[PDB]
Amino acid sequence: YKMGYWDGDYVPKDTDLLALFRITPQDGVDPVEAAAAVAGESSTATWTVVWTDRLTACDMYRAKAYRVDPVPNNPEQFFCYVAYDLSLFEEGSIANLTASIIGNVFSFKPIKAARLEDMRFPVAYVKTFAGPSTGIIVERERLDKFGRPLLGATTKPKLGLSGRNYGRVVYEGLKGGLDFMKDDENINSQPFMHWRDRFLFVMDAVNKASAATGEVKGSYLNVTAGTMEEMYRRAEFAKSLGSVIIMVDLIVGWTCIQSMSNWCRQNDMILHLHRAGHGTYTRQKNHGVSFRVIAKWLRLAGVDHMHTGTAVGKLEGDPLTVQGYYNVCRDAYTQTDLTRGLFFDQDWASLRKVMPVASGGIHAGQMHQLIHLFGDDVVLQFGGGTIGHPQGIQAGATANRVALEAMVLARNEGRDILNEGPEILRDAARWCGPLRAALDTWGDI
Amino acid sequence: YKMGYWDGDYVPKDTDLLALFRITPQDGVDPVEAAAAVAGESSTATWTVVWTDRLTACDMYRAKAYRVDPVPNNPEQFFCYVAYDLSLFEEGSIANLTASIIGNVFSFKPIKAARLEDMRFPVAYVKTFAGPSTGIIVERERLDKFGRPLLGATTKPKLGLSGRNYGRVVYEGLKGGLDFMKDDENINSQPFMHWRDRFLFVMDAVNKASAATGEVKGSYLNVTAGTMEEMYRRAEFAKSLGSVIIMVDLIVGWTCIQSMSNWCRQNDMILHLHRAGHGTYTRQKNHGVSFRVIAKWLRLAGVDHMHTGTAVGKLEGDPLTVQGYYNVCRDAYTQTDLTRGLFFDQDWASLRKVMPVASGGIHAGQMHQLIHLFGDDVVLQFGGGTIGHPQGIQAGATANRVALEAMVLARNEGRDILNEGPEILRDAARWCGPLRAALDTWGDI
Amino acid sequence: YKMGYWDGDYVPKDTDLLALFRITPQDGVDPVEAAAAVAGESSTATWTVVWTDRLTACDMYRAKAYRVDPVPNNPEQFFCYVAYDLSLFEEGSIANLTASIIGNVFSFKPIKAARLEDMRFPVAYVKTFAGPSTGIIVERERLDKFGRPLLGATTKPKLGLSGRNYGRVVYEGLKGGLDFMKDDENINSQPFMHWRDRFLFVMDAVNKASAATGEVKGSYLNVTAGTMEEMYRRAEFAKSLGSVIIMVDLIVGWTCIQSMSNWCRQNDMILHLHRAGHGTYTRQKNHGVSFRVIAKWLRLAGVDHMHTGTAVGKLEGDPLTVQGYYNVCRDAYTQTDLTRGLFFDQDWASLRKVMPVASGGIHAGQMHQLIHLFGDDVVLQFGGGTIGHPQGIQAGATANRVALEAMVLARNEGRDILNEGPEILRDAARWCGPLRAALDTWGDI
Amino acid sequence: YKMGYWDGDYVPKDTDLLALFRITPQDGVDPVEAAAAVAGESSTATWTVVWTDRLTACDMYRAKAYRVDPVPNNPEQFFCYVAYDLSLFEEGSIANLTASIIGNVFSFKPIKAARLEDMRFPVAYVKTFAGPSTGIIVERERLDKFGRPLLGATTKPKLGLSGRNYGRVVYEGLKGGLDFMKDDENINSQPFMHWRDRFLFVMDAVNKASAATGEVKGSYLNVTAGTMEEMYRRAEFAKSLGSVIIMVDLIVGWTCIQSMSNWCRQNDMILHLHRAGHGTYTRQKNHGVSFRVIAKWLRLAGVDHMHTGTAVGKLEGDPLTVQGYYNVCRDAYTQTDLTRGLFFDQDWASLRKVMPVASGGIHAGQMHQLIHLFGDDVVLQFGGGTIGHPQGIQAGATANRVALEAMVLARNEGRDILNEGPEILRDAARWCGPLRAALDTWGDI
Amino acid sequence: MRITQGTFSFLPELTDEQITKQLEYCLNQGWAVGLEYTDDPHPRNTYWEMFGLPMFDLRDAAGILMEINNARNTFPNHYIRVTAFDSTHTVESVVMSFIVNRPADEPGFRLVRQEEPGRTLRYSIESYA
Amino acid sequence: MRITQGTFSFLPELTDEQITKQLEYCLNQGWAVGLEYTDDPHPRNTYWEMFGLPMFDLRDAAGILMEINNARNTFPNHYIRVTAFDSTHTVESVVMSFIVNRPADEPGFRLVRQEEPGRTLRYSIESYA
Questions:
Q1: Does D366 touch chain C (CB under 8 A)?
Q2: What's the rounded Cα separation, in Å, for the pair B388 and B391?
């Protein structure tokens, strides 16, 4: 390796893929050679020399490693920047993207740990993907919901309820002010309640809710299944019932998501992505792939809602870093920001924006913090705080809704969301019984 | 958490899912509560209490954490065993399996690191999956190749060659004795050589090779693509040309693989799985998912060939641990073996066996080691050692082939494969020019 | 035979199929050898020895006969228990199940008579079937009918009426309180009234009835036909008209039923099974197959309603034995009960419960008996008693309905359904003219 | 009942269905009323009077019971003849036929036992069925095998062999002279050997055999499966491989068989019916349905091969009665024959003839008996006698083949097949080593 | 003209004495009891309006009966019903109606007949309110 | 019963003082403000009736507020709302309701249930006016 995989003064072309790794070489291994080895273990390279590539010539068809910088406050760890030529990747294929970039660099022993921190996609490349199947702007216009984050909860009962009772849980929540309801974390179609029956009842609930509130309602009908045939089968049924939104689990795979995204566009559906399982590689800051990258890929794939993070409000991740993720989803042009972990400037070439979804241990009490950290374009997913409300789900819904409504009004008036937050919430709770009870139970933290 | 997610003396039922994690709680967190939290962060649980679950009752529909043992030579790290009831999982759905088990346990902050070491699948559950689309026994019968590991190489030229020249590389290799040829690591169908053209030429080569050797030949035509529609499109073309085998990249997703497996069975194809990208979570022994688990899932999914590991022969992993992986693929009934990392007894309820694929920096010189460590049922994937052979690819092929043939004969005679290995190889090299040259270049290591 | 088909102290594995026969060997034949012969005449056996099975080895792939007990109050007749290994049966295939178990044992001369009394299905096996396409719980939720047996009658006119008049008979019945109406016993689509026309009118009636009562109504539109193509053709038309339920005749075959069950699930239909013709083998307690077994199979197949029996109320069968049948349909876990003919403990692994259908010469007068013997989950199919009511069908309907309503209320209050039955009915009849007339005509018996 | 269901001097019309039951009424019940009750429990009747049928008028749409005769050598048992009008049955629908005739007469308590002995189908009705999908004449012309019964064996190894070895068993048998090979009694596609793989190898064997003998060869590829979708899926694969014949199990159901028959005709396939499970009702001569009836139905359904019986040669049934069955299959016009159990004259209106299949414990030694009892149009299915032959299957095949060839030649010369049989066989065995060995092992019995 | 959308709806209106007996039956079986109401008794208009949370562990049928009458007062011109839930699989076990709208305006809901292709009709049952 | 078809609709009716504050917010962001009204508040009845052209460059929230009250007078028994458009991609950024029809006749719009094949229903939400 190294012989032709490293170029100290190589200037990246605007038509190049840039991958920034956090290489942690073995004690006694040169970081430079490591960077070069990265470039080799994900392209036209090998450990030894091959004659067949003489015809190939490669050169351009080689990943050229350039920058290699020391990591702040942590030696033995280094930021390696690699450049891949545009012609090395298949158009509109995240599976091929991931394949080519990652290669076998994460299993190459001379590197103790390696993590993908960020990437840069040339406009020329970004343009090969359709991007989100709906996007924030379009979604809001289908919802008639503007200038405020969206409200969402989860049908908590899970396995132990029948379709009738499950749908009720949905009706109560939506009517109480929730904009969306989510199928419980892991219920696809287990031996007790069949997905069809659930879909029928849930959609009955959604409709019943719309007619009682006078606004567009929905429920992320989980369409996740073992094969594409089932997945499409459930997607089609969801569509037939008239659902405005659908839900898929990340674990399904890049290729399945792309197919589902394509499907949604051609069927006018919002694709909600549930990032279940990401933690296996997006947790340890020394090995894996940073969620911001996963977020970029997902946007290229065409997802409409994406779980991004609670940010400080709950045990998940660092506020700024979370904002980096949020930026990847809502930026028209992502500007480099080392504090938010953004290492490259990413032009999204007019690809529709993705709706971030804040999930975790949150409640009305944190409203002011959330509104300040995320703003209007975010889906506030309240779980236990809503369902476990003393006066029922509908009450929890109204609580969060009011808490949101008021906080926005106040914020619009200019009031310091942060400092005045508690007061604003108290003022609202004063006339809003359910909010009062919500704060009494899940107050400050 | 904990309140009802831990049962010290809970005896797992034969109809239960068992997950064994390697929980590394935060400094100041009780491992027991952590285990219970694991059970809670992947089922009918939440951080707070909810009234809607009163109807649910759950109980059985709850993951009960039982065993919690200290980790040998490493405190602050603990083995947590959790039990999930059979009725919690959707039939024949790895996507749902992974979803339910993993949940959000890997992103739960109170746990610094967490890794899934092993799982147990009740026969009742195993029976919901079709298993491999071909399997070792059936494959060998289609190949007429018995009592010897299979030979395979890779079309190294990669991006820089045309279909004609690429197919040649395949013809030379197969004719020289290789049983299989693999599409280069990351070439799906980039802007230079179209997959169709490549398939046409490669298949011409495979056929030409068969007629020159008098045996069944094949090439893992990579069918990996961005959407299921392309993937099936390439699968169908591969099939039409008469290919005995196909190749898919792990990154595609559990659901795509299941669909491809189903397809292969119904089209009489061998499904070769390329584990590209696994390292992101299967590398660090403290966070992620152990490959042995990934291997179990893949078997349930229906993969026919699976990259398992070189084991000592090259930088990949520990011999015994690799044998654990190999066992998961070839065992009719996997017996618990703590040394090989096997924590549970797994009855494979007659599911066809998967063919392991040994890949990495290997060459004829290690033959004796490999034969001893893996035996007959394994595909020896030689890369640079074959292609980079001084007298061309065909020569490299013949080298590895002879090295294999002889080593088997000798091994069958009883000769100590290990100790006598070098000699046996020298004896063969003596009359086998290409082998001689192979050893002179890539000797002992 | 016998040489290796009998093992006195063989302990059945939890992953074994258990068949309990009532072998009546010929005068001069050893019961033990007979049992062993049973095991041989339904597997890898023959009358003589074969060399080809040397490779086979069989052993596990052999039915091992174990228990052989004398029959109470009847010598020359013996209960033979045989064990079949799980791997001998094809997944989700009742046709293969029946094939393998029955084999040619019933035509083996050395046995004068043989009857299949019961079977045990391992959870691992049960899980290969989807079970009922709706089930009691789900059905009730589609009907909004809880805590009371369902009411049903039959369109008695049969061949001699036109669609208009036929549909009327249905309208009258349903409006009068019947929950369901059944197509006459043998009218599929004979040369006089075309099934389509009948479906149109019947569905008009069902709808007209729903709008007059304010509850969900239905009619078991017989979809039974000569080929699967016709059957699906009628199922699809029934579906298009919006029918909540469909009806199929047992005679169609195990394979047709499985296909129809699959269809119903994917089309949200309730599958009513009419057990016409069963008597040919379920009548004589010395040869044939006990209905309880047929009932188990039907549940695995996926039927939603199943004719089980009147039990004492009319000439059909023994009360307890009938309860055994009812148990097979409604049990979550069937416990061994020799009095009710239940020889094995059957875990239904969460398969949805089947709705029994009580049919025969019954009428309002027996209400109290039925309610006591069956309870709430049963469809009371009244024939002549309803249609032949002095004041028309609607009146007969109201009679049975009231008789039911009252009997339930009373039963709920704690009143001795049995003893007080007649009085309770008299109390109701007092204010219910039609019931009065119903009792005057079809009183005590 | 009785009031209008019995007509002592009713003359059956040529356009009437005639069913002859063997009614065994309860001790104290009038046989006449019983006969009338039969007519009522399978049509427009009920236990009580209904007003809705006033419009109906029925009359013609009623089963009129006429003849009621005492049973020879057995009182308390009576032959009841019932007449059903042609317009009561749906065209080309055996399921409806069976439904209407059987009704619920077999479960009507006042009758201790009841058995269907025979039926008469008016030409007008017979013409609504297509009959066999090939027939004897056409089959022979596809086979180029005339004036001799056909030879067949069974792939005995069963579950315990792989496709390669299984196909071999087939190759050996066919090459040795067998005209057909049968998939083992209960192997559809169990968890060990997939039906596809088996089909591939078996068809390779069949072809290899054809090219070694110079005649048309085949193997009854079992296509029996759990749903029509699988069944057609296997039928289509069988067809694609070029198989001249297919096999289905009776248990599949009347409707499935009709669909398969239709399919075969339109795909030029011979439909072999395996009567597995019939014994449940065709064994006891006092309750059930006589196989001759089942045979008539099967012919109407369109089956091409039908297991009829060994007749005396082995434990199965009475020679004459078996000939009755054989007659039902091969007669152009079946004439009444009380000795052979034929109660009615049946005109088959030019429906193609069905090939009987003699199966059971038979061997070359009985040749002369078989040839005499059945003649040329029959498939001699030898099991253990062929496979278990001392010198292998091929030898067993040649034995049976020669035994057949010679026996025919001799029979043609006029020699008394019966008496001279043993000698003729000895004469052949003299020069035919394998036959000699066959007789030495399985001699006289 | 009378909505038969409930157990016992074919019998005369239950008296508080009868209702209490039923309530006891449910409570004896350990079923959560809930009260619901609506003005739209459409066949299969699941999700009626909840009148307070289900009286789960209320060991007093009388307490529930109280809420019933309370409801009848608040909503006289409405349909009200008691529903019993089995906390084991969460399903309804019993449901009977109590107060019914003023002489059920028109239980003969207007049956809408949309003329589809052929002689097929697409119905729509709708209450007159 | 209350149409929640707008931001702040879960709070008490805004006062002219609060409205002006919001109007300012929009104007400060440089958003074109428009007034709309309709008697048919169907969920997703886009294209309400425009009450005059959008006050584009009207550097006075008070001016807009005037038109609002003017509208309420002309159309009392109507729903009226302020919409803010972002002149960069032309999208709505804020929308809140002001005057609401007389005690929203029946926000529980009549839900129509057309019975489709199977157990599927084809709904139609329709205002009672």
A1: no
A2: 8
